[PDB]
């Protein structure tokens, strides 16, 4: 997953979870990437699927 094309003002709402380094399950790639941007690049991907 690459978040260079972020951030985006809106995300579709399908569920395909990713697990962030903050132990939070992100609902989809768009939600995860917006969070990474909001963290100023501190949040990273732990693994695919739920945490």
């Amino acid at each position: 997953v690459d978040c260079s094309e972020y951030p985006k003002p809106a995300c579709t709402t399908e569920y395909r979870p990713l697990c962030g380094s903050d132990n939070k399950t992100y609902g989809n790639k768009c939600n995860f990437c917006n969070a990474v941007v909001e963290s100023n690049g501190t949040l990273t991907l732990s693994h695919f699927g739920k945490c």
Binding site: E5, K8, P9, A10, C11, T12, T13, E14, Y15, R16, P17, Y26, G27, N28, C30, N31
Partner: protein, 185 residues
């Protein structure tokens, strides 16, 4: 199964929008971004209960899709959870609406704008969307937006979340009903 219930594809989970029909043929509407590249749909995460197969998909530009039921025994309620749906209508600014989704359940709000353009990026732009102050989260895609017994739209996406509040865009359901020549019941 009814509007707002979970639906699973080979890729992920979305929500059923509305059960509709044409003659004696039953289908269900959902988001186009959910039907895009999806063939078979199941009622459970274990993928043991089949629902049907994708019959149409329109995304981006629009955001709707339709699935033909192949499961002969599953009940196909013309409701949203317990709420009966009897007709479809056009959204209007200030209209009180309600959304039901498989992740967040039922949330209410109002229509704040019409004919909005939402750019999901990568060339995924959708037009003519209903803007609202209702929240929605991953898994809620395709779920119904209704107003009393009236079907209004299908959840497409937006920003924010249900805890802090958000903005969600919906595909007008009338457009989908017309395209496929189906009706709510």
């Amino acid at each position: 199964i009814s509007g707002g219930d979970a639906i699973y594809s080979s890729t992920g989970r979305c929500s059923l929008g509305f059960n509709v029909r044409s003659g004696s043929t039953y289908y269900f509407l959902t988001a186009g971004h959910c039907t895009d590249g999806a063939t078979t749909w199941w009622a459970n995460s274990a993928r043991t209960t089949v629902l049907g197969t994708t019959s149409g998909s329109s995304f981006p530009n629009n955001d709707y899709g339709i699935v033909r039921y192949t499961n002969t025994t599953i009940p196909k309620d013309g409701t949203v959870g317990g709420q009966d749906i009897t007709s479809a209508a056009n959204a209007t600014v200030g209209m009180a609406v309600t959304r039901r989704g498989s992740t967040t359940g039922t949330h209410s709000g109002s229509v704040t704008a019409l004919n909005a353009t939402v750019n999901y990026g990568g060339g995924d732009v959708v037009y003519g969307m209903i803007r609202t102050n209702v929240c929605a989260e991953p898994g809620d895609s395709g779920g119904p937006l209704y107003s009393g017994t009236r079907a209004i739209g299908l959840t497409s996406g937006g920003s924010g979340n249900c805890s802090s509040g958000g903005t969600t865009f919906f595909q007008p359901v009338t457009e989908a009903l017309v395209a496929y020549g189906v009706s709510v019941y």
